[PDB]
From a paper:
The spike (S) protein of coronaviruses is responsible for interaction with cellular receptors and fusion with the target cell membrane. The S protein of SARS-CoV-2 is a large, 1273 residue, type I fusion protein, that can be processed by host proteases into two parts, S1 and S2. The spike (S) protein of SARS-CoV-2 has been observed in three distinct pre-fusion conformations: locked, closed and open. To overcome this challenge, based on the locked SARS-CoV-2 S-R/PP structure, we engineered cysteines residues replacing positions D427 and V987 to generate a new disulfide-stabilized S protein S-R/x3.
Consistent with the predicted effect of the engineered disulfide bond, 3D classification of S-R/x3 particles showed that the majority of the particles (76%) are in the locked conformation, while 23% of the particles are in the closed conformation. Further 3D classification after symmetry expansion revealed that locked S-R/x3 spike protomers adopt two distinct conformations that differ primarily at domain D, we will refer to these conformations as “locked-1” and “locked-2”. In the locked-1 conformation, residues 617–641 in domain D form a large loop, of which residues 632–641 can be clearly identified in the cryo-EM density while residues 619–631 are disordered and not resolved. The locked-1 and locked-2 conformations differ primarily at residues 617–641 within domain D, and this structural perturbation is associated with differences in the FPPR motif and in residues around 318–319 which are located in the junction region connecting domain C and D. In this interaction, R634 in domain D is sandwiched between F318 of the domain C/D junction region, and Y837 of the FPPR motif, bridging these three structural features. These interactions appear to be further stabilized by hydrophobic contacts between the aromatic sidechains of F318 and Y636 and the domain D hydrophobic core. It appears likely that this zip-locking interaction not only maintains residues 617–641 in a loop structure but also restrains motion of domain C relative to domain D. In the locked-1 structure, we and others observed a salt bridge between D614 and K854 within the FPPR motif. In all of these cases the construct used had a D at position 614 and the locked-1 conformation was observed.
Residue numbers in the entry:
A (entry chain B): 701 to 1141
B (entry chain C): 305 to 618, 632 to 676, 689 to 749
C (entry chain C): 946 to 1141
D (entry chain A): 946 to 994
The structure:
């Protein structure tokens, strides 16, 4: 949208109201841990092929070393993102949070896996390819009619290892983070958890964004209602579509596609007379079958190396994303961030973490000014030949009277000696106007 | 290395060795017509070469050892040592007689009068060329002129193409109009075969056997015996010459009558029609499932636990059962004692399970603890404020650089070799 | 161990690259000299070409791994430079960026292929319970603390700073007044001393 | 120079990729047309592979 703004040397715009906005940021944390059996991908159930492959043990060892490094890195990424807090705080039985309703982000003990309802939604949006990790031999033998991709992967030496932390444990960690940041604030990230009423600490945060705490106490009901409505809007948005969580589905799809491509690449001759070990061995003796099998071994090794290189690059990307997620967990869940647009659009109030498959979802609660009003302004006022400047505020006027107000909210105050401070005479400053300064008795 | 550090290591997937071997060939007993092909009284001329179909027979070819001796016998696309262990799909014998010097021309990618104008082979030719001297048969006193070859043709023949036309060849510019004369030649010329010629001018009988392998149903088989079919066991199978290893199971697939094999997108054989009983059998690899080894240091102890991923332990596919067998969600753990306590992770198994070496001494497996579990006394009018403090010095270690490396290609690849 | 991992990774990569010279790569031997002493250049050129292709591929694999490791090391070094700027050359308000607790300062130390930051931080130690109120009603007005919190040891109401128990008597300069004392919930009753 | 480095790196990579078409890679020539004009598909398929 193309617009202008009414700039002037003596006109200011100040908000008279505000909104509490809850935004969603989705960050990948880990990807699928993968292990490769060289002897089975390259030389599936062929002994002579294995004997020929024996001289490429260094290549296969370095392949598996790289993949093991990737897997350990994924576990470490999850640990750094979610296990920042060492202690598992519980939610209080009473939910007297000053009108704030966290029932839709806190866990409930009805369902087995103690996940919040929003966490359940996030789980349901993104569909895992594996859906478990126990695929027995009898099952893959029984569904030969079905073209199951996991069975085809596992029959060629391509296995997916489980994550160290399950979804239940990660959900427990997130629940601990919610309990700590609701019942104690940012004190539990800097040491021992110190309790504090929720209203007083949202007022602390309001002070943190440059708004006086009296605004919060005078508009507590409105703020609570706005927060609840924003949470409900997030709930409906998640329940509507699944394209919001496409960042994690991209990770899942990329891993599955890489494994399936690696399976598909077993049909290449690589310069040999066939892509099948058994056909070569049944058509030629070892005499000249060794040459063709060497060609096939070289080609399939190269395919595996290509896969491992792509996985290393993707692991680097995922590690960057996980480091960002850990930084956001530290600076926005365990504290209040003054960095602009680091955690949501607007002045950051606080944040809530939610576990998602291979990732984290931050609900950033931010303060957004809503209803701006024009005023005429001056840098300073001349009273008795002296110049008065506001301490923490700005001089405004509704046409006739001059007031001093805080910056992010229209709370006009009468000009007073304690509101302002004096420095120098009132001629060097340009734009200075004339008004009186009330001196209290 | 001879020492292994503490941890979990991914070893090879679970392997099942074949118990026995089977062979399934079509139920045929007739011997292939070696007599009608090699012991033929009247071979064909090379320009009109005789093609004969061979089907529904056993190719022993040890009956040729008694009498037949072959000057040349070259096989393309198949090793001569495997011919007894194969079945051949659609077999044709192309028979003719040529000069001795022209036997070298019966090969893929050759040139000459025979290759260009009389008999041409593809280079995608799977089959065997056989040639033997027949001076005592095809040569008589005064010259045997019954064998003819095409000497002139406008263009080279296509592979396995036959040209029996006897139109007059126009070597010059003026048309010939169906009569011989200057620059107007009869295209066919007769071999002059006399018993007193040089070995390069003596008649040679040539038989070219053309066949395909391991792609279609076959009715010509080698002399191998047939074993009873066994299912649901890892076996070494030989189906119509296609060897392999795996488990054979009943199939719901319905093959068309012209199909013998079925393949994945990886071109490995899934299903095979059993040549004896017309049923479809699915082939499955008999090695499957990840295996991991949990160990403390080899200097600490020699005991290990084995995590068999994707098996259930609640005739198992395990190397050894023993005791201390129990099922996790990461797989079946064998050799580790489950304990109800929860400690900090030492060796991460996975799925929330970790393992350690504890005291008597044994490997234990447990659910790892996320940390000390506590609550906090929240209230709408209670606060907690510190009355003291501590100054804590922590350490953060960060890599900055790594080793700078240079590589000399000529010396790594071609160390002190000039030609390299 | 983080720096020893770098050193070990580089050494292991170089040693693996040395070990990979024993592969035939489809040739008849892994030794140039054996091939050249057993065959003339006639067909030795083919085997040497196979070996050249294979060893080139090994070198390319090594260089790719080194590039990826260099990217990781560059990320770590950029983080280290940011920490040097924001914690040694200044005081960081970012939570857990430099040590656990409220960051006071930091000291750098050189290490092989790396840096070691000694983060000096302030950690609250001995917490005590108090009863509290958002504000106090004095004369129908509402008083809020400027930079602090109202606490009470059961009987008297004080105002204290947030990260340390330093109770102060309620005074007009400690607090500020805005509006009447009915809209605010949780407000309690107490007096406010006005200095002479 | 930081942006010129990006531009130069991309151009150099593409030019190197063009230059690498002169390698035989173990074949008898680096030119498809020479191989196809000197050998039939029979054994030209091997060199082209
Ligand atoms: C600031 O904005 C909020 C809503 O964003 C206003 O609250 C609404 O006021 C109208 C009229 O009283 C009601 O019909 C709505 O139900 C209120 N909505 C909510 C969520 O409370 C509020 O009045 C505005 N305050 C000022 C000073 O303008
Ligand atoms: C907080 O919001 C929920 C609705 O989003 C309120 O309603 C509850 O919703 C949950 C699940 O949808 C149900 O299990 C409860 O039975 C609902 N409660 C009632 C009274 O119907 C919930 O009441 C709100 N919390 C508070 C304290 O008002
Ligand atoms: C603001 O107040 C001062 C003092 O009343 C004004 O200064 C006077 O301006 C007039 C005309 O320029 C002079 O005649 C006087 O001598 C000035 N008095 C002093 C003490 O300086 C000033 O003009 C006023 N400015 C505005 C915009 O109203
Ligand atoms: C197959 O048949 C065609 C037609 O007879 C041959 O092509 C002709 O070759 C003569 C050579 O002088 C030309 O004059 C004609 O113009 C060609 N006609 C066409 C349609 O191509 C062809 O040579 C034959 N191929 C073989 C291998 O015998
Ligand atoms: C705050 O904690 C420090 C120590 O962490 C206390 O200092 C100790 O006090 C005891 C009793 O006087 C001495 O025995 C120790 O030698 C002191 N240790 C140190 C390092 O000085 C201090 O007294 C505490 N302050 C308050 C108000 O509780
Ligand atoms: C705090 O002080 C005010 C004023 O003394 C109290 O307000 C009075 O409350 C009683 C009973 O509710 C009424 O009879 C009076 O009319 C009220 N006076 C005024 C000026 O409002 C208030 O109740 C006190 N609150 C607490 C918790 O002690
Ligand atoms: C004396 C002049 C020679 C100049 C020719 C130079 C290059 C061309 C090489 C041509 C092949 C040589 C003739 C072979 C004839 C085919 C023999 C056969 O029937 O198999
Ligand atoms: C402030 O002034 C400009 C132009 O004078 C006008 O466009 C704008 O709408 C005014 N702001 C409000 C809130 O009305
Ligand atoms: C400006 O505010 C004061 C105090 O509310 C009021 O007396 C005055 O009428 C207002 N003037 C205008 C133009 O709004
Ligand atoms: C502000 O702008 C207006 C018009 O642009 C001009 O008349 C006036 O002198 C300016 N005042 C100051 C202090 O710059
Ligand atoms: C013999 O051949 C027939 C097919 O004509 C087949 O039905 C039969 O099964 C074969 N004999 C055995 C023992 O398989
Ligand atoms: C071919 O002919 C000779 C003599 O005529 C005979 O001994 C031999 O058995 C025959 N071989 C075959 C396969 O019939
Ligand atoms: C292994 O254990 C022995 C103690 O018997 C100790 O001397 C040695 O240092 C240990 N080695 C490793 C690699 O842990
Ligand atoms: C197979 O393993 C799963 C857990 O992975 C378990 O729920 C199930 O009971 C096991 N099967 C049997 C027959 O116990
Ligand atoms: C562990 O707890 C279960 C029930 O909670 C019990 O059946 C079992 O005997 C216990 N095992 C040990 C070693 O304590
Ligand atoms: C504060 O109160 C709670 C429960 O009333 C108690 O558990 C806690 O120990 C108290 N804090 C201190 C420092 O005693
Ligand atoms: C609270 O603090 C004041 C001032 O030290 C003291 O007079 C009073 O006795 C204390 N009351 C309690 C219950 O500690
Ligand atoms: C605070 O909580 C207690 C019990 O939960 C209740 O009696 C009291 O009314 C509450 N006070 C406020 C201001 O919410």
């Amino acid at each position: 949208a193309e617009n202008s703004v009414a700039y002037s040397n003596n006109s200011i715009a100040i908000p008279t109201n505000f909104t509490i906005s809850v935004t969603t940021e989705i960050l990948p944390v880990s990807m699928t841990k993968t292990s490769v059996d060289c002897t089975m991908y390259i030389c599936g159930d062929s002994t002579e092929c294995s004997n020929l492959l024996l001289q490429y043990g260094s290549f296969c060892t370095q392949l598996n070393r790289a993949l093991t490094g990737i897997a350990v890195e994924q576990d470490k990424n999850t640990q750094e993102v979610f296990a920042q807090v060492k202690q598992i705080y519980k939610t209080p039985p009473i939910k007297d949070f000053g009108g704030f309703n966290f029932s839709q982000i806190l866990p409930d003990p009805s369902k087995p896996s103690k996940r919040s309802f929003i966490e359940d939604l996030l789980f349901n949006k993104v569909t895992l390819a594996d859906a478990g990790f126990i695929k027995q031999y009898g099952d893959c033998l029984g569904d030969i009619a079905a073209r199951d991709l996991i069975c085809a992967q596992k029959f060629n030496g391509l296995t997916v290892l489980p994550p160290l932390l399950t979804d239940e444990m990660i959900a427990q960690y997130t629940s601990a983070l919610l309990a700590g940041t609701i019942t104690s604030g940012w004190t539990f990230g800097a040491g021992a958890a110190l309790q504090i009423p929720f209203a007083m600490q949202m007022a602390y945060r309001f002070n943190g964004i440059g708004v006086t705490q009296n605004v919060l106490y005078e508009n507590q009901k409105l703020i609570a209602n706005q927060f609840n409505s924003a949470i409900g809007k997030i709930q409906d948005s998640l329940s509507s579509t699944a394209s919001a969580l496409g960042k994690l589905q991209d990770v899942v799809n990329q891993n599955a596609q890489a494994l399936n491509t690696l399976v598909k690449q077993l049909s290449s001759n690589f310069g040999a007379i066939s892509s099948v070990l058994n056909d070569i061995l049944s058509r030629l003796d070892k005499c000249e079958a060794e040459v063709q099998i060497d060609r096939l071994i070289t080609g399939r090794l190269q395919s595996l190396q290509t896969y491992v290189t792509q996985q290393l690059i993707r692991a680097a990307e995922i590690r960057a994303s996980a480091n960002l997620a850990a930084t956001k967990m530290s600076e926005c869940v365990l504290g209040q961030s003054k960095r602009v647009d680091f955690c949501g659009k607007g002045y950051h109030l606080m944040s809530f973490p939610q576990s998602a498959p291979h990732g984290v979802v931050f609900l950033h609660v931010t303060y957004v000014p809503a209803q701006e009003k024009n005023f005429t302004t001056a840098p300073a006022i001349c009273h008795d030949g002296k110049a008065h400047f506001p301490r923490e505020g700005v001089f405004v006027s509704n046409g006739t009277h001059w007031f001093v107000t805080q910056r992010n909210f229209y709370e006009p105050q009468i000009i007073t000696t304690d509101n302002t401070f004096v420095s120098g005479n009132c001629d060097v400053v340009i734009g200075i106007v004339n008004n009186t300064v009330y001196d209290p008795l | 290395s001879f020492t292994v550090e503490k941890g979990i290591y991914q070893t090879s997937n679970f392997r099942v060795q074949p118990t026995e071997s089977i062979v399934r060939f079509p139920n045929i007993t007739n011997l292939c017509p070696f007599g009608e092909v090699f012991n033929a009284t009247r071979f064909a001329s090379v320009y009109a070469w005789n093609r004969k179909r061979i089907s529904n027979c056993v190719a022993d070819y040890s009956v040729l050892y008694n009498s037949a001796s072959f000057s040349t016998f070259k096989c393309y696309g198949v090793s001569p040592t495997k011919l007894n262990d194969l079945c051949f799909t659609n077999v044709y014998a192309d028979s003719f007689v040529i000069r001795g010097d022209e036997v070298r021309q019966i090969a893929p990618g050759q040139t000459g009068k025979i290759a260009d104008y009389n008999y041409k082979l593809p280079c995608d030719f799977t089959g065997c060329v056989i040639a033997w001297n027949s001076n005592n048969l095809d040569s008589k006193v005064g010259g045997n002129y019954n064998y003819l070859y095409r000497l002139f043709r406008k263009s080279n023949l296509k592979p396995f193409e036959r040209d029996i036309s006897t139109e007059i060849y126009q070597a010059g510019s003026t048309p010939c109009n169906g009569v011989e004369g200057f620059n107007c030649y009869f295209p066919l010329q007769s071999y002059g075969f006399q018993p007193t010629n040089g070995v390069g001018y003596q008649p040679y009988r040539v038989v070219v056997l053309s066949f395909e392998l391991l792609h279609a149903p076959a009715t010509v088989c080698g002399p191998k015996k047939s074993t009873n079919l066994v299912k649901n066991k890892c076996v070494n199978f030989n189906f119509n010459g296609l060897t392999g290893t795996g488990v054979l199971t009943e199939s719901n697939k319905k093959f068309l009558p012209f199909q013998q094999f079925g393949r994945d997108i990886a071109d490995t054989t899934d299903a095979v029609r059993d040549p004896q009983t017309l049923e479809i059998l699915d082939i499955t690899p008999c090695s499957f499932g990840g295996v991991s080894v949990i160990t403390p240091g080899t200097n600490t102890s020699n005991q290990v636990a084995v995590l068999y991923q994707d098996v259930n332990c609640t005739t198992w596919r395990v190397y050894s059962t023993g005791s201390n067998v129990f099922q996790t969600r990461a797989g079946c753990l064998i050799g580790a004692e489950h304990v109800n306590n929860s400690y900090e992770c030492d060796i991460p198994i996975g799925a929330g399970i970790c393992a350690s070496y504890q005291t008597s001494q044994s490997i234990i497996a447990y659910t790892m603890s996320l940390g000390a579990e506590n609550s906090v006394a929240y209230s709408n009018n209670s606060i907690a404020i510190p009355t003291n403090f501590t100054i804590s010095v922590t350490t953060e270690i960060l890599p900055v650089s790594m080793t700078k490396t240079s590589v000399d290609c000529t010396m790594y690849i071609c160390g002190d070799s000039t030609e390299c």
